């Protein structure tokens, strides 16, 4: 996702990625009070990137989500440590190839 740069671009420190297993639409940030303890969101602290000069400095912060169920929709969004937050995107993990549903059906 886009790199964030405040007015004085100096000392950029942190991103925060949120993801939960979601059905359709009905997902919000301020959902079922994360408060202190039992949480409603799976959270990742993402270290600020390294710029690497001025011409082509988009060394786009990212993250590899592992430990996800297959054929599952995930509500996901990023936030900049207390600037900008991304919108809630739903991402569905991969499921079976049609070919591979067939096999398992067609061969005991």
């Amino acid at each position, epitope marked *: 996702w*886009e790199p964030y740069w405040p007015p004085d671009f100096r000392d950029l420190l942190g991103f925060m990625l949120f993801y939960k297993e979601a059905p359709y639409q009905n997902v919000t940030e301020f959902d079922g009070q994360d408060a202190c303890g039992s949480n409603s969101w799976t959270v990742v602290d993402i270290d600020p990137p390294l710029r690497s000069n001025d*011409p*082509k*400095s*988009q*060394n*786009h912060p*990212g993250w590899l989500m592992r430990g996800l169920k297959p054929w599952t929709q995930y509500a996901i969004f990023v936030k900049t440590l207390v600037g900008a937050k991304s919108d809630i*995107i739903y991402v569905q993990t*991969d499921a079976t*190839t049609f*070919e591979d549903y067939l096999h398992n059906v067609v061969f005991v």
Partner: antibody, heavy 112, light 108 residues
Framework: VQLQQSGPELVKPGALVKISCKAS????????IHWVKQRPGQGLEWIGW????????KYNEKFKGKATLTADKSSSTAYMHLSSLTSEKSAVYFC??????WGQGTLVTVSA | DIQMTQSPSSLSASLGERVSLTCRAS??????LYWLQQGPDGTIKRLIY???SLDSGVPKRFSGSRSGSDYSLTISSLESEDFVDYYC?????????FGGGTKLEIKR
């Protein structure tokens, strides 16, 4: 950041050819290498990808048995082998690091 | 597979003209579209990510926009180096797919 590809690649039909893509200027292991085919006078087709960290791949069904994707983290170089080449004529193959930066292209010509 | 329909496949224009190319998505792709530029030497370069975000170094005469299922690339004032090939690409869903391309040619 540079994806520096191989070829000219002249190959006989029924053979196999391995095209490389040496990466530099960034941490190889952190990104995906995607491969794309371009049949001249035409568009771009997505072949599939590799994650150099895990060695995990995903292919386009069209290219499943044809292309085989490989990475050598010791040299930070990625490969693509094409198999059983026949009347493909010529095509230019590109690797790209998650689309922002692409390699220059490698022409594979099949001739006897 | 999401089909990306690119129009026009070819376009004649002159220096200093404003031109737009379009990609229509067969399914909703949200904001997940790239615009790619290919030089006569074959070099591919990304100009726009996430429908409207310009990559570092890309001249400001390049812009991306969306209206319904139409994603457009606009060159506000053509330069001689812009008369090359352009391709859209969707990354919203598992089979990544490309538009058929637009060749931009000089009017005579």
């Amino acid at each position: 950041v540079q994806l520096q590809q191989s070829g000219p690649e002249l190959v006989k039909p029924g053979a196999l050819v391995k095209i490389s893509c040496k990466a530099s200027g960034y941490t190889f292991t952190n990104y995906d290498i995607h491969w794309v085919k371009q049949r001249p006078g035409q568009g771009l087709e997505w072949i599939g990808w590799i994650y150099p960290g895990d060695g995990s791949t995903k292919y386009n069904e069209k290219f499943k048995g044809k292309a085989t994707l490989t990475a050598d983290k010791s040299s930070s170089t990625a490969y693509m082998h094409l198999s059983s080449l026949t009347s493909e004529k010529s095509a230019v193959y590109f690797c790209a690091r998650e689309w922002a930066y692409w390699g220059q292209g490698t022409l594979v010509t099949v001739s006897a | 597979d999401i089909q990306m329909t690119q129009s026009p496949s070819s376009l004649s224009a002159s220096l200093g003209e404003r031109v737009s190319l379009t990609c229509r998505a067969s399914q909703d792709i949200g904001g997940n579209l790239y615009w790619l530029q290919q030089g006569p030497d074959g070099t591919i370069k990304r100009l726009i990510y996430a429908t409207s975000s310009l990559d570092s170094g890309v001249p400001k005469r390049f812009s991306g926009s969306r209206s319904g299922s139409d994603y457009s690339l606009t060159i506000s004032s053509l330069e001689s180096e812009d008369f090359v090939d352009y391709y859209c690409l969707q990354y919203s869903s598992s089979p990544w797919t490309f538009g058929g391309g637009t060749k931009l040619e000089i009017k005579r």
